[PDB]
Amino acid sequence: QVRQFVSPIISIDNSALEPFLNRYPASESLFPVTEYEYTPWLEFPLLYSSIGKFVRVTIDIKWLNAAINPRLCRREIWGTDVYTDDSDIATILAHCGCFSLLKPVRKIAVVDLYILPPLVHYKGTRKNQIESRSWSSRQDGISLKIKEVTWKPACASIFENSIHTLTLEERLQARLELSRSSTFK
Amino acid sequence: QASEEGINQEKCINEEYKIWKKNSPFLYDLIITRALEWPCMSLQWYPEQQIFAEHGYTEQKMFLGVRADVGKYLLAVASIQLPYLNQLRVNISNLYSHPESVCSAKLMPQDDSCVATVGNYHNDVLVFDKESFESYSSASESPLKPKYRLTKHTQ
Amino acid sequence: WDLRNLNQRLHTLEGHEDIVTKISFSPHEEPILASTSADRRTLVWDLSRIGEDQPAEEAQDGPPELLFMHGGHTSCTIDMDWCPNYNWTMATAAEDNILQIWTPSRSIWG
Amino acid sequence: TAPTSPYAATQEELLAFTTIRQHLPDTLAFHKFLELLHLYREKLLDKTELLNSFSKLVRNDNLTLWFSEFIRWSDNPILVKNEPVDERVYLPETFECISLTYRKLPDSWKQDKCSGRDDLDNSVLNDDYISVAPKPSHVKNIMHHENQYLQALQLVEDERYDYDRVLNTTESAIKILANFCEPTIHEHLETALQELERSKRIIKNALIIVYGKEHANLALDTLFKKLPTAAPVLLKRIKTKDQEWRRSKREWSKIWRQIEKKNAQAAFDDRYCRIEGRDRRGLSYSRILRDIDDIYQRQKHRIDGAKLGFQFTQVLCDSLIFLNILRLSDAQLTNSSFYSYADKGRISAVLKALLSQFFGIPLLGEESKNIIGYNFFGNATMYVLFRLICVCYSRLEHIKLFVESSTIYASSTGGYENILNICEKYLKGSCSRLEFRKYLQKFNNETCYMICSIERLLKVIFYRIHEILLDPKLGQLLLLFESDGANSVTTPREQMVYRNHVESILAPESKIFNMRWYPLEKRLCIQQLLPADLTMHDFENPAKAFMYYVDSYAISHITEGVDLMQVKMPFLRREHFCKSNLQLFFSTDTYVIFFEPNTENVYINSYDQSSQSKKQNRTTNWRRWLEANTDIKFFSETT
Amino acid sequence: MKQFEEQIERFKQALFEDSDASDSDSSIGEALTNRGLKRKKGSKNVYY
């Protein structure tokens, strides 16, 4: 009998950017210009000369943790579905809905982002419990939009798995040896 | 260089250890940790039970097959103390050396005395009975011989 | 797996993030299933929680049909077995020469 | 009477909210309600979800509607459009350079014409080169405007300018309108109606000022029609406004004059102001903490190859400078006005104790001391206190060195000492600040400008110390310090149990700050430690490392040196006889735990239709979800 | 009830808060740009 309210829908019209997203054809936009390794101290250069191409960022597993990453709490993201190039790429992933902040991730991310001219207005909307802020003045960088996200099938090799490749009894015999000398109690 | 990974990994194994050890009194109603001599390849609970009500517990039985070493392959029976509701040690004994390896040792449900044993080292199934355990004497130099040898496989 | 509908996987329980090795039912209640894996954990599932609701923070530990998780060991657990004379109790032998007799508190299932 | 703050809580809303809490049957429900509000404040609680939880706590419909009315809730499809900016606002920086800043133009931009150009200007003016200024990217040391006596004068001037433009506009409009008010106006109207079109702007501005930007157009039109009877009412209104504004400007000019006197005197010093502003902006609590935190975070992750270790290092050579600092401190402390009679004694004592004990200032079988670095563990307050003290010391010492080495004021016997005595005089109230500053100007030195900051530094220090004397957790802490001032040379376990004591005495959330004193080098080192961090970073051999680890695993609450980014908690976050027989066996080269056999550990806690019905619900829901001789066999076996 | 009034006023101020704002205590000095240092108390007045 409780009243049930419904939070609204959110519609996104990236129709004016169409001449830029399709500037270069397919089959000739395969290689990103440059590639960066994400860290909370990464700063893109100014990329005016390469509008309409894409870049490749690589995020490690620790960075997607709301407890290790310090930048994740300051909420440094401006825009919705097209962001200023000051925005923290981790927050872009977590706001564009590619992982969840509450559950911890277990793979390396490879993100490919578009390069887009500045916009007249950057609208801030709340999604996935991430409230991106808005910028009404004139931006001075460029804008980025997610082209595609790819997770790494293998991120790291836990040694109990590399030894899990060995047979039970065989690896168990080396177990007994270590138990012998041990040089201490 | 690989050391670093291995030692870190061992250390967080230890980590998981006392982080389970530390909060145990808020998780379980019973914990009995036993450092047996040898690696125990298998375990099977025994359906017969002693109830010492005046003393105040029950003992159950366990059948283990362990390796002492390579080629030293053995079996054992344990008695296990459980506390009593209706009104404290793990005892190893009955250790008989096996002719070859045990990977699986199953006892017949309606008769405990029989155990079919096979291992990763032989294609023969060896089934043991009353006499085979009770004709064995720990003073003897030889291991047991099972009730029967069953062989059709080649692996 | 159910034998009258074998065209279809009956359900799939997630939560181990490397090889699972061996599994066993509870000889006292059927909805309780135990599973052991290489990541040094044994998970106990109460299957009476298919399709249930779970709060946001409740989704961290896994799907709601997961019941309990025991990790007192320090290597690959070799095997388990339920003590059929006492409820909720299980014995586990592991690769590091260790035996574990354990039963959770009433509070989680009582 | 009492002032209403901006967006202050109104009486209706406070009444309604207290009735809301009253309908809430419990103080616990009221606390849950405050929790709802706060979690909405902290960007973890949505709007609609706030409304939903509010309703499921209030269970009343009209209050839900009143909330949804106060929350200003509106459910509409939020429209987000992305419009690029015009090509000409960024395109310049793709042009083929010619020099640093001048870039050749493309042919599509040399295709617009100026229509008033004759044959001369098509041969003098520059047509195809622009001036593309350079663009900063990531400026990371921003300068401020520090003179705050210049900006007060500038504000005075802006305010009087704003009064003037208004008064002048109303004056001119009064003139015109009063011209339009007379007896014979109905006669010659088409001439007055022409002197109104030529002055529409002055009157439009007068209306914008007296009415607002909404009624301005209305009045302008209505007067364009009904002129010879609209003009008088406007005239009356505008004259009333003019009179009151002039009256106001008189009485505030009464005050602008005093502002200008005082700050005009004291604003011709852009030497003192930069120094003092940069200073005060440097020693802010949160700024200090954020500096040390940034350095620590850069170490932990090895961003530039930097490995862990110490984050602050500095050498404190003299031993008399500390007594100078104590002198200045007591001088100022006798002349403050925050603290009662006893707090002066308390704070003086605390400063003396922490100086002598820690810094060891007098107030082949002996080197073991100088080899053992003394350790202090504290919280943010202690770190800030020690940073201030090191800054004060550094500045005093630089002063003394510059007075001695510089061969003009060193020639006097006690120039540095004269400075000290003058500061002593001033801090007690015996000398004022004007003599102070003009005498300081004798040195002509910024390095000697740095002497005035001592009053500020001491004020911050006294404040920290006092907030510690009220911090009830202080005692043990400093007492613990006393305790560790008695050992000869420590084995790890003592330091680790000390650190665990300290870490326990605080709440579960806090950091630790470690301050280490090397009397051999007389060096102070500071670092910041979180739960799983190493206290001693340097081990000369792997055996020593293993020893210290095993000791830590034994005692330390959380093992030091283990990568917490790799631990994975092993459980879900949700008469008794006990005998323990377990020995933790370790290898010295792989750290694997073994157990010595015949070990028994036992834990015992002495303390159905539900299970069957849960089983049945399982069967039912799961079967509801569900819908060759093998089937023959099975269907033989089915029921 | 003074603390309760302060709480209500604080909640009202939070509702009152503008869509875009400056949270950091440090303001933007001269700094001649806003890239990087938005949310800096006056960075809406700065651009290229």
PDB file of N, CA and C in Angstrom, chain B residues 32-58:
ATOM      1  N   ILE B  32      37.785 -27.899  15.699  1.00  0.00           N
ATOM      2  CA  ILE B  32      38.847 -28.792  16.144  1.00  0.00           C
ATOM      3  C   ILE B  32      39.864 -28.868  15.018  1.00  0.00           C
ATOM      4  N   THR B  33      41.051 -28.325  15.257  1.00  0.00           N
ATOM      5  CA  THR B  33      42.122 -28.341  14.276  1.00  0.00           C
ATOM      6  C   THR B  33      43.154 -29.377  14.687  1.00  0.00           C
ATOM      7  N   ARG B  34      43.477 -30.278  13.769  1.00  0.00           N
ATOM      8  CA  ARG B  34      44.364 -31.397  14.045  1.00  0.00           C
ATOM      9  C   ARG B  34      45.520 -31.410  13.062  1.00  0.00           C
ATOM     10  N   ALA B  35      46.739 -31.414  13.592  1.00  0.00           N
ATOM     11  CA  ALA B  35      47.941 -31.500  12.773  1.00  0.00           C
ATOM     12  C   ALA B  35      48.391 -32.951  12.754  1.00  0.00           C
ATOM     13  N   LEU B  36      47.798 -33.731  11.862  1.00  0.00           N
ATOM     14  CA  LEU B  36      48.176 -35.126  11.733  1.00  0.00           C
ATOM     15  C   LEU B  36      49.589 -35.230  11.190  1.00  0.00           C
ATOM     16  N   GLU B  37      50.140 -36.437  11.273  1.00  0.00           N
ATOM     17  CA  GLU B  37      51.509 -36.645  10.839  1.00  0.00           C
ATOM     18  C   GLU B  37      51.663 -36.336   9.360  1.00  0.00           C
ATOM     19  N   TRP B  38      50.728 -36.813   8.554  1.00  0.00           N
ATOM     20  CA  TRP B  38      50.904 -37.111   7.144  1.00  0.00           C
ATOM     21  C   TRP B  38      49.795 -36.464   6.340  1.00  0.00           C
ATOM     22  N   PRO B  39      49.980 -36.316   5.030  1.00  0.00           N
ATOM     23  CA  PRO B  39      48.884 -35.856   4.167  1.00  0.00           C
ATOM     24  C   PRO B  39      47.831 -36.943   4.023  1.00  0.00           C
ATOM     25  N   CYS B  40      46.587 -36.582   4.338  1.00  0.00           N
ATOM     26  CA  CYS B  40      45.449 -37.489   4.273  1.00  0.00           C
ATOM     27  C   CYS B  40      44.756 -37.331   2.927  1.00  0.00           C
ATOM     28  N   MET B  41      44.915 -38.327   2.063  1.00  0.00           N
ATOM     29  CA  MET B  41      44.307 -38.314   0.744  1.00  0.00           C
ATOM     30  C   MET B  41      42.784 -38.345   0.780  1.00  0.00           C
ATOM     31  N   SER B  42      42.170 -38.947   1.800  1.00  0.00           N
ATOM     32  CA  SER B  42      40.718 -39.058   1.816  1.00  0.00           C
ATOM     33  C   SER B  42      40.212 -39.233   3.240  1.00  0.00           C
ATOM     34  N   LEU B  43      38.904 -39.029   3.408  1.00  0.00           N
ATOM     35  CA  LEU B  43      38.214 -39.229   4.677  1.00  0.00           C
ATOM     36  C   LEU B  43      36.807 -39.731   4.405  1.00  0.00           C
ATOM     37  N   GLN B  44      36.292 -40.553   5.313  1.00  0.00           N
ATOM     38  CA  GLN B  44      34.922 -41.033   5.205  1.00  0.00           C
ATOM     39  C   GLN B  44      34.380 -41.258   6.608  1.00  0.00           C
ATOM     40  N   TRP B  45      33.254 -40.622   6.917  1.00  0.00           N
ATOM     41  CA  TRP B  45      32.680 -40.751   8.247  1.00  0.00           C
ATOM     42  C   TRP B  45      32.066 -42.129   8.443  1.00  0.00           C
ATOM     43  N   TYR B  46      32.117 -42.594   9.678  1.00  0.00           N
ATOM     44  CA  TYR B  46      31.655 -43.902  10.108  1.00  0.00           C
ATOM     45  C   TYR B  46      30.281 -43.791  10.765  1.00  0.00           C
ATOM     46  N   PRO B  47      29.307 -44.589  10.316  1.00  0.00           N
ATOM     47  CA  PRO B  47      27.934 -44.434  10.821  1.00  0.00           C
ATOM     48  C   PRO B  47      27.711 -44.981  12.221  1.00  0.00           C
ATOM     49  N   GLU B  48      28.649 -45.734  12.788  1.00  0.00           N
ATOM     50  CA  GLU B  48      28.501 -46.222  14.153  1.00  0.00           C
ATOM     51  C   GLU B  48      29.042 -45.196  15.139  1.00  0.00           C
ATOM     52  N   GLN B  49      28.402 -45.111  16.301  1.00  0.00           N
ATOM     53  CA  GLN B  49      28.622 -44.008  17.219  1.00  0.00           C
ATOM     54  C   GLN B  49      28.537 -44.484  18.662  1.00  0.00           C
ATOM     55  N   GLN B  50      29.442 -43.968  19.492  1.00  0.00           N
ATOM     56  CA  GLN B  50      29.373 -44.140  20.935  1.00  0.00           C
ATOM     57  C   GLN B  50      28.847 -42.872  21.588  1.00  0.00           C
ATOM     58  N   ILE B  51      27.999 -43.051  22.599  1.00  0.00           N
ATOM     59  CA  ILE B  51      27.392 -41.947  23.334  1.00  0.00           C
ATOM     60  C   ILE B  51      27.761 -42.160  24.799  1.00  0.00           C
ATOM     61  N   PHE B  52      28.632 -41.301  25.322  1.00  0.00           N
ATOM     62  CA  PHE B  52      29.007 -41.332  26.734  1.00  0.00           C
ATOM     63  C   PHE B  52      28.272 -40.217  27.475  1.00  0.00           C
ATOM     64  N   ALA B  53      27.015 -40.507  27.812  1.00  0.00           N
ATOM     65  CA  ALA B  53      26.142 -39.467  28.344  1.00  0.00           C
ATOM     66  C   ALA B  53      26.584 -38.996  29.722  1.00  0.00           C
ATOM     67  N   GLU B  54      26.985 -39.915  30.603  1.00  0.00           N
ATOM     68  CA  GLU B  54      27.383 -39.503  31.946  1.00  0.00           C
ATOM     69  C   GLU B  54      28.690 -38.718  31.866  1.00  0.00           C
ATOM     70  N   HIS B  55      29.696 -39.280  31.189  1.00  0.00           N
ATOM     71  CA  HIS B  55      30.876 -38.518  30.801  1.00  0.00           C
ATOM     72  C   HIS B  55      30.521 -37.272  30.005  1.00  0.00           C
ATOM     73  N   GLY B  56      29.582 -37.383  29.070  1.00  0.00           N
ATOM     74  CA  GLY B  56      29.056 -36.227  28.374  1.00  0.00           C
ATOM     75  C   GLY B  56      29.650 -35.912  27.016  1.00  0.00           C
ATOM     76  N   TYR B  57      29.744 -36.892  26.119  1.00  0.00           N
ATOM     77  CA  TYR B  57      30.033 -36.575  24.728  1.00  0.00           C
ATOM     78  C   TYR B  57      29.530 -37.709  23.849  1.00  0.00           C
ATOM     79  N   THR B  58      29.947 -37.667  22.590  1.00  0.00           N
ATOM     80  CA  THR B  58      29.852 -38.798  21.682  1.00  0.00           C
ATOM     81  C   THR B  58      31.181 -38.941  20.955  1.00  0.00           C
TER      82      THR B  58
END
